[PDB]
Design a protein around this ligand. Structure first.
Ligand SMILES: Cc1c(N)cccc1N
Lengths: 257, 1054
């Protein structure tokens, strides 16, 4: 009843042991002038707490003589026949098997340095990801802007053709090539200027794909760091929990960690 | 020998990281032209003329469009086709901006650099769209920082439906403004800055000899120059009008005037004047105890004599222009088929995710997890099979959720996520509202782009996350299909839900005999029950309720109406997946007794998404929440908008109206919205709201637009200092800074405007000799300005505030807010600890403003200054000795009282909030002896995400230094009465916060919205439970607090 595997005997650190366990995983807890014990069960991925002359129970069907009595019965069976909306029943509670205590504690530092080195790599890349998302979108807007600029110039190389070829045929002899050269010059500037702008826009779009390429490669490697970070952290949490069963040593821990 | 000769082969130091010179993270934003920060001082600009000619002027960076136009048409004469141009006056400039929109440049005073031009060119045109007036939307869009057109071409009906309907609220507020104008207009602009209570705490009351204050009314007569004191001694609880009279009495008593002749000269004169605060645009515009105005109450506390000014109402109503509000340019299926008709389970067809970036080496197989939610979930969570894993992943499955379509609640939302495989690990996520804003159940095909899993989330699905598709295109796009029922299904009317609820009750009244699992169902209740209910009511939000307690609550819901405050708990005890239940709850909440705002605010967090509930919650605010207390909690109310399902909602209509009713709220409401605009989770939502505000706010837009323009100048300026003027001497940088600031574009832009930190303060001229870049690597700017008040002298001649590009202010913003609140709790509950919650304001992505506190120093400076020449050790006493050096005489004794009263409160706030470890370089002491912490780092113990685990840290650990000073220089200070009293403050402080713990949970719960890594989910906030010890009795808490306090101190502490 002290040991009881699942039996620990507060709210917060329960939820840390219930974080990322699947549908059906459970444990029991201990104000006493409130109720005695508390079955904290994670049905469907959400904390579902259940309150507990001799007989331990949930409300009226009290004939179970112990805390261990009531939980063996409902490891076999669901909680539906007690309370309507409850159709779920994992009593969850390696480490190289090490009885070393000290050398288990060195590994905790080692895994934690591995983990904390690993979190920074994940943290780095999350900045890269979002900066890249920004840099990209700024490039996209810039492309809309270039494209827009270009319209105004394409429209301007057109805009002049209407007025300029009205001012060639009207007159013609008056300032023959003295006029029409210096209208051809201005226009020959105008189109090569367009020519430069388009090439400036292209050169952004090639950089866009190289950026968007790298953007994939960040996420790609984020998603291969992620699953490792979960296990690396989870192994650290079992190494740290395995220690904090035998010797209390809450304060000794912090040098390794 | 050191390393076992083990070579690290990968490591390189030819530049290998931003650990080396480790500061200044956030980027980027190009400034004055595309791809460059600060445009060249002389620059070539292509002018595109209406005759099709490209004449290129060399212009100065700094030059006005007037100057450019005027030169362009002088220089277009030298190019051909001059007879085809009109007189320059028939033209306006245009170009493509960096936002990517062809902006017409109407305000021709603007300078070439200030245009935000992308490419440096200008097209000439005669002004299309003859309403010049109306295309000062560009004003709005400047203030918002995204052009107003960008909405106008949004497809989505909701968005347009928001834009058009929200003007209801805007026009209603403008009505209230010009109601008793010009008084009410001044009432909008310059609301009375006033504490919530008129009642005075007992430690203020004792500073005034049975409620009397020596005031100083000032006046001006001719020409302006000379002013005259009029040093009244009026009552604390006397109103501005009485204070205005006595001033005019004493002004105009005379030897050529009988008393009867004075009384008449009082009356005429009296109400032609109103009271200003000397030195800032604050005023005393309504019947309020003088003490109730914040300026007075601070003058009491600080041992100061209020300097007010008598101001003529007409010289005031001179300075208010007209609001000039205008309605903008922009002005189901035959009774459908009620969701309750629909006879089927929920099923949602998953189809194909397209853009999923995963190593086929690393990850085996990948699947879509799904689930339905309400904050928590109304059925067993389900997935789909592990099919087509990684390479082009596709499942054409109907997922089957065990809930009947009618038992969907209004606020139901699907939450999904692509995952990796117990190698379980989310790749993306996205959530969708199962109904739309028109109440319509979601049918057919939907295409959802997903969000990347953030830092703190390990969990698979993430329903607190924002509802809707990512706008970012190039991300995982998981499209899917919902069931179609030959008819648009709408959510039931309330009239109909009222009937089903009335039926559900009458039905229960004949359910008979034993109903074991009494659980969800006696008229006369037991006394032990009625005590187990109020006992539940008192519990904080994070004390999670059991199934027993829920069922117990849900049954006695009709008694729960006697104890309104239970409502949060009750609502979380409803089976949201039983419309029978939900409907009955909708009839309680209808006429549930309104509750206190501090309690009603919980009901707008993520755990209460139902619209009816949130209505009740806004209904509470509408009643109790004063413009004071709204302003106090405005950050938590802006943040809580994210959790609303739809754009258009009662909470937005509330806050928007309040913003337009009162300009001090308005101000911060703009800036907090504007602060977040870079975050694409809310860009749309907040943009739309900010448009509405900006459109209806009256002249303030133009004031905002200068504040905004100043902030952009500084953002650019620093951005440049931080890149390319890095690896440069301060000497070289400071030269560059001053050089820049002297250019006239900077001079215009950074001078005549209002403090975003506090728009009451004006900001005048730049004294550039007192402007400088601090030593920090983030290259913050220490900026200084002349206070252009008439009475600068009487308040502060120099206003100086710190601009810091590079650092996420919002953690600080919230901790400082929380501090401010603990102070108000403490003080207003008669106990005087003096926290200095200095001003802080994030105006953007890691960009903000921090209030300077003149004459304060880091303990380090104190000790550097007090350190002996031969570099040996710094003396614990030097603090004490440096403090004495300032405070000498009866002063000394009082300055230790301050240091003790501050140091105590800061100990208890620090401990409870668990903020970053305190040490000599982040603790500050003022000349007058007040202590206050700066640079808080991570609040709720966010370096416990590495190891952590029941660490319940003490961050302010009072070294000798502090103890000496508390104990007036004795040795073995830990044993004096000086110290006993100190501890008794610390205990009394700790309990006060422990009785308001609900609020601080809820404030932190409201803040989960913002994307702060310190606030990822409720367990983050749970630290504040341990540290307040809310699972325990208060007596254990006291003992816990001591225990905790003792062990870190090696001290006495019993
Ligand atoms: C309401 C709630 C659920 N369902 C799970 C975890 C935390 C909280 N606060």
């Amino acid at each position: 009843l002290q040991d009881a595997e699942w039996y620990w005997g507060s709210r917060e650190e329960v939820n840390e042991k219930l974080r990322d366990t699947a549908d059906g995983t459970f444990l029991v807890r201990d104000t006493k002038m409130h109720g005695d014990y508390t079955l904290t069960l994670r049905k469907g991925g959400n904390n579902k707490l259940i309150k507990i002359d001799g007989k331990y129970g949930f409300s009226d069907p009290l004939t179970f003589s112990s805390v261990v009595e009531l939980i063996n019965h409902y490891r076999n069976e669901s909680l539906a026949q007690y309370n309507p909306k409850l159709d779920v029943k994992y009593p969850v509670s390696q480490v190289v098997k090490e009885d070393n205590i000290e050398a288990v504690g060195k590994k905790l530092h080692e895994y934690n340095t591995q983990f904390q080195e690993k979190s920074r790599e994940y943290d780095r890349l999350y900045e890269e990801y979002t900066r890249t998302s920004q840099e990209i979108q700024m490039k996209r807007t810039a492309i809309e802007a270039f494209n827009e600029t270009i319209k105004i110039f394409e429209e301007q190389c057109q805009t002049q053709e209407r007025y300029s070829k009205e001012y060639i045929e009207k007159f013609k002899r008056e300032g023959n090539e003295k006029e029409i050269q210096r209208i051809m010059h201005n226009y020959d500037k105008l189109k090569s200027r367009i020519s430069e702008i388009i090439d400036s826009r292209r050169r952004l779009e090639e950089d866009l794909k190289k950026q968007a390429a790298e953007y994939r490669e960040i996420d790609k490697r984020m998603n291969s760091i992620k699953p490792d970070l979960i296990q690396l952290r989870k192994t650290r949490d079992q190494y740290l929990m395995w220690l904090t069963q035998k010797g209390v040593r809450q304060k000794k821990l912090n040098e390794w960690l | 020998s050191y390393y076992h000769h083990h070579h690290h082969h990968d490591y390189d130091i030819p530049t290998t990281f931003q650990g080396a010179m480790g500061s200044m993270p956030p980027r980027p934003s190009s400034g004055e032209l595309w791809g460059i920060h600060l445009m060249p001082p002389r620059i070539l600009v292509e002018c595109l003329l209406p005759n099709g000619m490209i004449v290129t002027l060399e212009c100065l960076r700094e030059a006005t469009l007037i100057t450019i136009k005027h030169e362009l048409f002088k220089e277009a004469r030298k190019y051909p086709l001059h007879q085809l141009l009109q007189d320059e006056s028939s033209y306006i400039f245009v170009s493509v901006t960096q936002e990517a929109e062809r902006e017409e440049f109407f305000d021709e005073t603007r300078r070439l650099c200030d245009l935000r031009l992308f490419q440096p060119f200008l097209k000439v045109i005669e002004p299309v769209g003859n309403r010049e007036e109306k295309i000062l939307n560009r004003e709005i869009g400047f203030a918002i920082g995204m052009p107003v057109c960008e909405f106008d071409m949004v497809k989505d009906p909701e968005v347009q439906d928001f834009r058009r309907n929200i003007l209801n609220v805007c026009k209603e507020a403008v009505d209230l403004r010009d109601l008793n104008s010009p008084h009410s207009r001044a009432m909008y602009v310059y609301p009375p800055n006033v504490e919530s209570s008129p009642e005075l705490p007992k430690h203020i009351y004792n500073k005034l000899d049975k409620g009397q204050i020596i005031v100083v009314i000032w006046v001006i007569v001719s020409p302006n120059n000379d002013k005259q004191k009029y040093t009244l001694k009026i009552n604390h609880d006397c109103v501005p009008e009485q204070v205005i009279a006595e001033a005019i009495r004493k002004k105009t008593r005379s030897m050529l005037l009988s008393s009867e002749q004075l009384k008449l000269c009082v009356l005429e004169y009296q109400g032609k004047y109103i009271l200003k605060v000397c030195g800032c645009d604050e005023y005393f515009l309504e019947k309020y105890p003088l003490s109730q105005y914040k300026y007075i109450r601070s003058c009491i506390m600080l041992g100061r004599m209020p300097n007010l000014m008598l101001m003529a109402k007409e010289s005031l109503y001179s300075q208010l222009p007209m609001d000039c509000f205008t309605m903008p340019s922009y002005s189901g299926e035959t009774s459908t088929k009620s969701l309750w008709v629909i006879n089927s389970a929920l099923r949602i067809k998953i189809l194909c995710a397209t853009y999923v970036n995963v190593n086929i080496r690393d990850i085996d197989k990948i699947y879509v997890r799904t689930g339905i939610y309400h904050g928590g979930e109304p059925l067993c969570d389900n997935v789909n099979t592990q099919r087509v894993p990684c390479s082009n992943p596709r499942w054409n499955e109907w997922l089957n959720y065990d809930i009947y379509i009618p038992d969907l609640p209004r606020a139901a939302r699907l939450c999904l996520s692509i995952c990796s495989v117990e190698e379980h690990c989310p790749l993306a996520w996205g959530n969708i509202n199962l109904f739309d804003y028109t109440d319509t159940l979601v049918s057919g095909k939907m295409a959802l782009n997903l969000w990347p899993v953030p830092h703190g989330l390990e969990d698979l699905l993430n329903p607190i996350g924002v509802t809707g598709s990512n706008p970012n295109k190039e991300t995982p796009c998981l499209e899917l299909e919902f069931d179609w029922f030959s008819s648009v299904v709408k959510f039931p009317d309330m009239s109909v839900i009222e009937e089903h609820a009335n039926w559900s009750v009458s039905r229960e009244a004949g359910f008979s005999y034993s109903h074991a699992g009494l659980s969800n169902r006696d008229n006369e209740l037991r006394e032990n029950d009625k005590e187990q209910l109020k006992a539940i009511s008192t519990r904080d939000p994070l004390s999670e309720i059991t199934e027993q307690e829920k069922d117990f609550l849900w049954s006695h819901r009709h008694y729960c109406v006697t104890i309104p405050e239970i409502l949060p708990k009750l609502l979380l005890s409803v089976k949201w997946n039983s419309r029978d239940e939900v409907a009955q709850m909708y009839c309680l909440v209808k006429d549930w007794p309104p509750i206190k705002p501090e309690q009603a605010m919980e009901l707008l967090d993520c755990n209460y998404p139902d619209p009816m509930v949130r209505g009740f919650a806004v209904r509470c605010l509408e009643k109790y929440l004063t413009d004071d207390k709204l302003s106090q909690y405005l950050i938590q109310l802006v943040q809580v908008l994210k959790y609303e399902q739809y754009l258009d909602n009662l909470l937005v209509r509330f806050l928007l109206k309040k913003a337009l009713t009162n300009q001090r709220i308005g101000h911060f409401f703009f800036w907090h919205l504007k602060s977040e605009m870079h975050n694409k989770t809310v860009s749309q939502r907040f943009g739309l709201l900010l448009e509405s505000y900006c459109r209806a706010c009256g002249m303030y837009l133009k004031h905002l637009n200068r504040q905004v323009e100043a902030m952009e100048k500084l953002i650019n300026l620093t951005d440049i200092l931080k890149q390319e003027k890095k690896d440069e001497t301060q000497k070289v940088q400071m030269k560059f800074l001053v050089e820049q600031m002297r250019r006239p574009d900077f001079m215009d832009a950074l001078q005549g405007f209002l403090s975003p930190l506090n728009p009451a303060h004006q900001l005048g001229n730049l004294r550039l000799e007192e402007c400088r870049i601090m030593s920090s690597a983030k290259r913050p700017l220490w900026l200084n300005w002349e206070n252009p008040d008439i009475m600068s002298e009487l308040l502060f001649q120099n206003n100086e505030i710190i601009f810091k590009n590079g650092d996420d202010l919002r953690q600080d913003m919230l901790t400082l807010q929380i501090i401010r609140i603990m102070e108000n709790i403490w003080q207003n509950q008669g106990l005087d600890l003096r926290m200095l919650p200095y001003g802080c304001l994030s105006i953007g992505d890691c960009v903000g403003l921090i209030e300077v506190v003149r004459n304060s120093h880091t303990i380090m400076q104190i000790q550097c200054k007090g350190g002996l020449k031969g570099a040996l050790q710094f003396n614990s006493h030097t603090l004490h000795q440096w403090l004495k050096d300032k405070n000498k005489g009866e002063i000394y004794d009082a300055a230790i009282d301050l240091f003790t009263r501050s140091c105590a409160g800061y100990c208890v706030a620090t401990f409870i909030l668990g903020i970053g470890d305190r040490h000599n370089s982040n603790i500050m002491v003022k000349d007058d002896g007040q202590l206050f912490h700066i640079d808080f780092g991570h609040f709720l113990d966010h370096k416990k995400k590495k190891f952590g685990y029941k660490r319940e840290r003490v961050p302010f650990v009072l070294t000798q230094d502090f103890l000496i000073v508390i104990s007036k220089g004795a040795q073995e200070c830990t044993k004096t009465r000086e110290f006993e009293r100190f501890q008794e403050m610390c205990y009394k402080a700790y309990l006060a916060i422990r009785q308001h713990a609900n609020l601080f949970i809820n404030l932190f719960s409201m803040m989960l919205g913002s994307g702060m890594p310190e606030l990822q989910s409720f367990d983050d906030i749970a630290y504040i439970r341990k540290t307040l010890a809310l699972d325990k009795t208060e007596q254990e808490a006291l003992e816990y607090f001591m225990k905790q306090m003792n062990d870190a101190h090696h001290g006495g502490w019993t």
